[PDB]
Amino acid sequence: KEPEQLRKLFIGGLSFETTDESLRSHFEQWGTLTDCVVMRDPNTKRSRGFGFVTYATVEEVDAAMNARPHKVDGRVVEPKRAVSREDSQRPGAHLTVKKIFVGGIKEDTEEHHLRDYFEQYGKIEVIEIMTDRGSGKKRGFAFVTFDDHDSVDKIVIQKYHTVNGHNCEVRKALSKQEMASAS
DNA sequence: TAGGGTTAGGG
């Protein structure tokens, strides 16, 4: 059995009217639900506008994500891979982005090294292996842009990534200003 | 639109 964290989707933008039951009614169309909850304010019981659904397998999660866009109780909602409580504290953890930062890549890394690891996650649009503009020296990191934000979301929730023979660190790309704001 | 009484003892 796969870990609960990887079987779970965050569902944002729920209608006020959505309950555990109507959410379940919709998302069971793509597999067995082991968990399904709408988050509510404890005192007022009013919906917080989001919840979670958990499938019995990650394959069912993939099937649900392939069926976007999802309309639940008359509202288009925003399903996202569930980011752990720990990781949710990091700058940019919940951004909707198509680009990843790939850190700690060998100096002799070439585009094909990145394709041979990342193409299995989604359609690649742009690969940029970064060099210093003045010196031409390799800087040890790259950016990869995909055609679907879910490709990025599914990558960054995994721990290890092997490029050009060795582990690298993969994070959602923060803009120049976001990087400054995160410092 | 980021979590449900779900996060650092006591030796």
- Return the amino acid letter for A53: V
The CATH classification number of A4-82 equals 3.30.70.330
Resolution limit in angstroms?
1.5
C1' nearest to CA of A94: which nucleotide?
Answer: B2
State which approach was used to obtain the coordinates: X-ray
State the nearest residue by CA to the C1' of B5: A42
Q: Is A74 left (phi over 0), alpha (psi -120 to 50) or beta?
A: left
* Residue A118 CA, nucleotide B6 C1', distance (Å): 33
Distance between CA atoms of residues A2 and A127, nearest Å: 31
Q: What are A5's two structure tokens? A: 């964290």
Strand stretches in A13-153, DSSP E: 33-40, 47-55, 71-72, 75-76, 78-81, 99-103, 124-131, 138-146
Chain B footprint positions (protein CB, under 7 Å) = 1-7
**Domain segments of chain A as ranges:** 4-82, 99-174
Torsion of CA A159, A155, A79, A57, to 10 degrees: -70
C-alpha to C-alpha distances, A12 to A2, A54, A75, nearest whole angstrom: 23, 14, 11
Going by the DSSP 8-state scheme, the letter that residue A5 receives in this structure is: G
Q: How far does chain A reach from its first CA to its final CA, in angstroms?
A: 38
C1' nearest to CA of A36: which nucleotide?
Answer: B4
Distance between CA atoms of residues A100 and A80, nearest Å: 16
Q: Which fold has domain A99-174?
A: Alpha-Beta Plaits (3.30.70)
Matching CATH topology for A4-82 and A99-174?
yes
* Residue A152 CA, nucleotide B7 C1', distance (Å): 27
* Residue A91 CA, nucleotide B5 C1', distance (Å): 27
